[PDB]
Amino acid sequence: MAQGLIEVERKFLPGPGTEERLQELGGTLEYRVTFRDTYYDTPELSLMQADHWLRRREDSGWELKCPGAAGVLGPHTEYKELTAEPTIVAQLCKVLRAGAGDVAAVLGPLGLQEVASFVTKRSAWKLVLLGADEEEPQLRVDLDTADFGYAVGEVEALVHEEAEVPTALEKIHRLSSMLGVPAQETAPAKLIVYLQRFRPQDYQRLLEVNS
Ligand SMILES: [Cl-]
Ligand SMILES: [Cl-]
């Protein structure tokens, strides 16, 4: 189970020189892929309010991201990636305060409805660091373009235990600086931009309740 359940990440807005600097560091373009995700939430965006993200990826399956360090690390920084459907069901019941063995079965009972569906084109780069001669010596950089035109990058470390997260954060920040990402720069998740575009009243309601 070598990869790890915990995503540590930093989103950014790509520029013309991002891939070249990745290459010059020894990074490689591992693949280019296109994937369709459908996201689910209550009409109140209860999951999004709790920094939970539930999606079913075509030809891949369900995933629930939920914060690994809620209240300690800011949103869009660390997520446990839940893919075993019984764990997803348990965590959804927990967050939403509610006999489903699979996620499809729980949507009705929990009041979860489709809130977005869209396709992303991704260039997945990986950087093996120090020729692999260190702990967790691979960082991923995804360069995504959503079908609505939004371009977003993510520098990502996948680790196994919360105790690895501080070091992962440090390495992601250092790689981010080398790719030319301003320290203060933020970039919204694709789903948030989808809501801005196509469900602007939901996006406004989200801003209001999150404050
Ligand atoms: Cl397994
Ligand atoms: Cl995103």
Swiss-Prot record:
<dbReference type="GO" id="GO:0042357">
    <property type="term" value="P:thiamine diphosphate metabolic process"/>
</dbReference>
<comment type="function">
    <text>Hydrolase highly specific for thiamine triphosphate (ThTP).</text>
</comment>
<dbReference type="GO" id="GO:0006772">
    <property type="term" value="P:thiamine metabolic process"/>
</dbReference>
<dbReference type="GO" id="GO:0009229">
    <property type="term" value="P:thiamine diphosphate biosynthetic process"/>
</dbReference>
<keyword id="KW-0963">Cytoplasm</keyword>
<feature type="binding site">
    <location>
        <position position="154"/>
    </location>
    <ligand>
        <name>Mg(2+)</name>
    </ligand>
</feature>
<dbReference type="GO" id="GO:0016311">
    <property type="term" value="P:dephosphorylation"/>
</dbReference>
<keyword id="KW-0479">Metal-binding</keyword>
<dbReference type="GO" id="GO:0006091">
    <property type="term" value="P:generation of precursor metabolites and energy"/>
</dbReference>
<dbReference type="GO" id="GO:0050333">
    <property type="term" value="F:thiamine triphosphate phosphatase activity"/>
</dbReference>
<protein>
    <recommendedName>
        <fullName>Thiamine-triphosphatase</fullName>
        <ecNumber>3.6.1.28</ecNumber>
    </recommendedName>
</protein>
<feature type="binding site">
    <location>
        <position position="122"/>
    </location>
    <ligand>
        <name>substrate</name>
    </ligand>
</feature>
<comment type="subunit">
    <text>Monomer.</text>
</comment>
<comment type="similarity">
    <text>Belongs to the ThTPase family.</text>
</comment>
<keyword id="KW-0007">Acetylation</keyword>
<dbReference type="GO" id="GO:0005829">
    <property type="term" value="C:cytosol"/>
</dbReference>
<dbReference type="GO" id="GO:0000287">
    <property type="term" value="F:magnesium ion binding"/>
</dbReference>
<feature type="binding site">
    <location>
        <position position="55"/>
    </location>
    <ligand>
        <name>substrate</name>
    </ligand>
</feature>
<feature type="binding site">
    <location>
        <position position="142"/>
    </location>
    <ligand>
        <name>Mg(2+)</name>
    </ligand>
</feature>
<dbReference type="InterPro" id="IPR033469">
    <property type="entry name" value="CYTH-like_dom_sf"/>
</dbReference>
<keyword id="KW-0460">Magnesium</keyword>
<dbReference type="Pfam" id="PF01928">
    <property type="entry name" value="CYTH"/>
</dbReference>
<feature type="binding site">
    <location>
        <position position="154"/>
    </location>
    <ligand>
        <name>substrate</name>
    </ligand>
</feature>
<feature type="binding site">
    <location>
        <position position="9"/>
    </location>
    <ligand>
        <name>Mg(2+)</name>
    </ligand>
</feature>
<feature type="binding site">
    <location>
        <position position="57"/>
    </location>
    <ligand>
        <name>substrate</name>
    </ligand>
</feature>
<dbReference type="InterPro" id="IPR023577">
    <property type="entry name" value="CYTH_domain"/>
</dbReference>
<dbReference type="GO" id="GO:0016787">
    <property type="term" value="F:hydrolase activity"/>
</dbReference>
<feature type="binding site">
    <location>
        <position position="156"/>
    </location>
    <ligand>
        <name>Mg(2+)</name>
    </ligand>
</feature>
<feature type="binding site">
    <location>
        <position position="7"/>
    </location>
    <ligand>
        <name>Mg(2+)</name>
    </ligand>
</feature>
<dbReference type="InterPro" id="IPR039582">
    <property type="entry name" value="THTPA"/>
</dbReference>
<feature type="binding site">
    <location>
        <position position="65"/>
    </location>
    <ligand>
        <name>substrate</name>
    </ligand>
</feature>
<feature type="binding site">
    <location>
        <position position="11"/>
    </location>
    <ligand>
        <name>substrate</name>
    </ligand>
</feature>
<feature type="modified residue" description="N-acetylalanine">
    <location>
        <position position="2"/>
    </location>
</feature>
<feature type="binding site">
    <location>
        <position position="190"/>
    </location>
    <ligand>
        <name>substrate</name>
    </ligand>
</feature>
<feature type="domain" description="CYTH">
    <location>
        <begin position="5"/>
        <end position="198"/>
    </location>
</feature>
<dbReference type="InterPro" id="IPR012177">
    <property type="entry name" value="ThTPase_euk"/>
</dbReference>
<keyword id="KW-0378">Hydrolase</keyword>
